[PDB]
């Protein structure tokens, strides 16, 4: 529960087709929030899933999404799904009973994503 | 890890539109395997997800699917996805990196599902 139990405060999960949008989010989050793009050995307090059409199509992305929700946001974790570039009708059904940020919100949803991240950090020692 | 730590050996997860197919599976599993249809207070060793078009469309089904994979099949659990009545092209992408039974297999996939259930039970005291 210690703020320093992890070296990063948040990492962004994205598919290869959204590399630039991910970098913008990382840049937006760090303006202090220490962020980076998620990687294999990546371990942070919060994980932002940049869910886009490309992401939803990629099997590995979906798998990472699953595990990101398996051991995390049950209550003790922090996983923030950002639905971007998608029609709400194409949103993953399971989201109706889960927290997530809509890309149509202010700042492409970045503002609410950052806010959600900060809220979690405060609950840390 | 005790075979009697749970009152049921397996329960079937289905959407309202597949009630009959679920009952057939339950019936098939018990011919000893103690099975039933999954319910809110339901707790068993294995959980069979009867994934069909209706299931994939229903938000609550998907959510239950998620949680069924969140705390389960990481290694210590038992969750068996049965893809039935669907074109493989419409299968959830995350399945490419996970175990699952195809409905096109022998006995509508029931045989392999039962086998998978038994395998898990043996690993129990």
Author numbering:
A (entry chain A), B (entry chain A): 79 to 109, 128 to 221
What does the paper say about this structure?
Mal, which is also identified as the TIR domain-containing adaptor protein (TIRAP), is essential for the TLR4 and TLR2 signaling pathways. Mal acts as a bridge adaptor to recruit the MyD88 molecule to the activated TLR4 dimer on the plasma membrane. The C-terminus (residues 80–221) of Mal, referred to as Mal-TIR, is the TIR domain and is required for interactions with TLR4, TLR2 and MyD88. The overall structure of Mal-TIR consists of a central five-stranded parallel sheet (βA-βE) surrounded by four helices (αA, αC-αE) on both sides.
Among these, D96N, E132K, R143Q and E190D have been reported to cause a loss of function in Mal. The D96N mutation has also been shown to impair recruitment of MyD88 to the plasma membrane and to influence the post-translational modification of Mal. To further understand the molecular mechanism underlying these associations in the Mal-TIR mutants D96N and S180L, we determined the crystal structures of these mutants. These structures showed that neither mutation interferes with the overall structure of the TIR domain. We also found that the surface electronic potential map and hydrophobicity of the Mal-TIR D96N mutant does not obviously differ from that of the wild-type protein. Our observations are inconsistent with the recent conclusion based on an in silico model that the D96N mutant fails to associate directly with MyD88 because this mutation affects the distribution of negative charge on the MyD88 binding site of Mal. Our direct binding assay also showed that Mal-TIR D96A retains the same binding affinity to MyD88-TIR and TLR4-TIR as that observed in wild type, and the D96N mutant is capable of binding with MyD88-TIR. Additionally, the D96E mutant, which retains the negative charge at that position, results in the complete loss of NF-κB activation. Thus, we conclude that the loss of function in Mal D96N is not caused by interference with the interaction between Mal and MyD88 but instead by another mechanism, such as altered post-translational modification of Mal. We also showed that D96N and L165A can bind normally to MyD88-TIR.
